[PDB]
C-alpha cells in the first residue's frame, strides 16, 4: 500500500497500491505526471490523445472518458486517477482506487513531488525538479537578456468564439512565462486575472490587458484569423512590434512536465527570436 500521505487537494477513495502496474487517467491535467514517473498508463482522455508531445508515450493507452465505466472495468486498473469535478467519481471507485485532485491546490512542480511521496518515486520526481530548476534560471536571464527584466506578458487562449486571459498557474504557458521566468504580467491582469486563473473577456477589451508580450494558445491556426485581422488588434503595440507568439493549445493547454518541456523550448526560441 501507498502511504497515501495528507495533501492539500488530494482525495483517496480505498486503498491506494504501493506500485500500481495498471493506471487509467482521467484527467489531462495528470497524465503526463504520472508518464514521467514512469506510471503504466493503459487509459487516457482524448486531449492526451491530442497532445502530440504526450502522445508518442501512450500509443499503448485506450483513450476513455471518465462515463466509459464498461472500457475502464475491462482495462482492469489497479488505480485511477481523476479531477475533483469529476460527476461520478462515486461509480468509478467501485472499480479500482482512486485518487481525485483539486486543481490548483498544490502547484505544478509540488504536484510531481506529491506524486513522488505517493508511489515512492522520490528520486525521478526530485532528479527532473532538480534539473527544471537549473534549466528555467538559465533560460530567464537569457530570456530576459532579450526582453528587459521588467517586460510584461500576457497569457490568452482562443476556444471556439471565445477569447481568455490566463494567470500563473492555468495552463498556456502561464507557469513557464510568470513562474518559470519570473515575468511580470500587466497590471490589470494580476488585478482581474491572477486570483481566478482564467477570465473570459470581450476582444474589444483586449488593448487594455496587454503590454510588452503576448502568448496565444489555440487549437489552430484559423481559429483567431477574424482578430488578427481587425483594426482593434492591429492597434495594439505588441502587435505592432510583433511580439505575438502563437502557440499550439493541444500542448499547451497542459502543466505536464513532458509538455512544460516542449513548451519550455517553444518558448525560450519564439522570445530570443523576437
Ligand atoms: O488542467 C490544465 C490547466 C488548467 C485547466 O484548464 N483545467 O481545466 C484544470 C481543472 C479546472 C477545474 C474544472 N473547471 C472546468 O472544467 C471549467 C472549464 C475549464 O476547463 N477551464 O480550464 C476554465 C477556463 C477555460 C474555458 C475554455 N475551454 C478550454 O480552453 C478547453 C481546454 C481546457 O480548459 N481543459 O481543461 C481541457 C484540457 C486541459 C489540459 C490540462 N491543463
Ligand atoms: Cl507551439
Ligand atoms: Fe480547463
Excluded at 514521467?36 to 500509443?59: E, H, R
Excluded at 499503448?60 to 462515463?67: G, S
Excluded at 500542448?251 to 509538455?259: E, G, H, K, W
Amino acid at each position: 500500500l501507498s502511504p497515501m500521505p495528507q495533501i492539500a487537494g488530494v482525495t483517496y477513495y480505498g486503498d491506494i497500491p504501493k506500485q500500481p502496474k495498471r493506471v487509467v487517467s482521467l484527467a489531462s491535467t495528470y497524465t503526463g505526471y504520472l508518464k514521467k514517473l514512469d506510471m503504466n498508463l493503459v487509459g487516457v482522455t482524448s486531449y492526451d490523445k491530442k497532445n502530440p508531445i504526450l502522445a508518442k508515450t501512450v500509443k499503448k493507452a485506450k483513450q476513455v472518458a471518465a462515463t466509459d465505466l464498461e472500457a475502464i472495468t475491462t482495462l482492469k486498473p489497479d488505480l485511477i486517477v481523476v479531477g475533483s469535478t469529476e460527476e461520478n467519481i462515486k461509480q468509478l471507485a467501485e472499480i479500482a482506487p482512486v485518487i481525485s485532485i483539486e486543481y490548483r491546490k498544490r502547484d505544478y512542480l509540488q504536484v510531481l513531488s506529491d506524486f513522488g511521496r505517493i508511489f515512492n518515486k522520490e528520486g525521478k520526481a526530485k532528479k527532473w525538479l532538480k534539473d527544471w530548476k537549473t534549466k528555467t534560471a538559465a533560460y530567464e536571464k537569457e530570456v530576459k537578456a532579450v526582453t528587459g527584466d521588467k517586460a510584461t506578458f500576457t497569457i490568452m487562449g482562443l476556444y471556439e468564439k471565445d477569447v481568455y486571459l490566463f494567470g500563473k498557474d492555468w495552463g498556456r504557458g502561464g507557469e513557464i512565462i510568470h513562474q518559470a521566468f519570473h515575468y511580470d504580467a500587466p497590471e490589470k491582469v494580476k488585478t482581474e486575472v491572477f486570483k481566478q486563473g482564467y477570465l473570459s473577456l470581450s476582444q474589444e477589451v483586449l488593448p487594455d490587458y496587454i503590454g510588452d508580450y503576448v502568448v496565444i494558445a489555440a487549437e489552430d491556426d484559423k481559429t483567431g484569423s477574424a482578430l488578427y485581422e481587425s483594426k482593434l488588434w492591429q492597434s495594439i503595440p505588441a502587435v505592432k512590434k510583433h511580439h505575438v507568439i502563437k502557440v499550439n493549445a493541444n500542448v499547451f493547454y497542459f502543466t505536464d512536465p513532458l509538455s512544460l518541456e516542449y513548451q519550455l523550448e517553444t518558448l525560450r526560441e519564439a522570445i530570443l527570436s523576437s
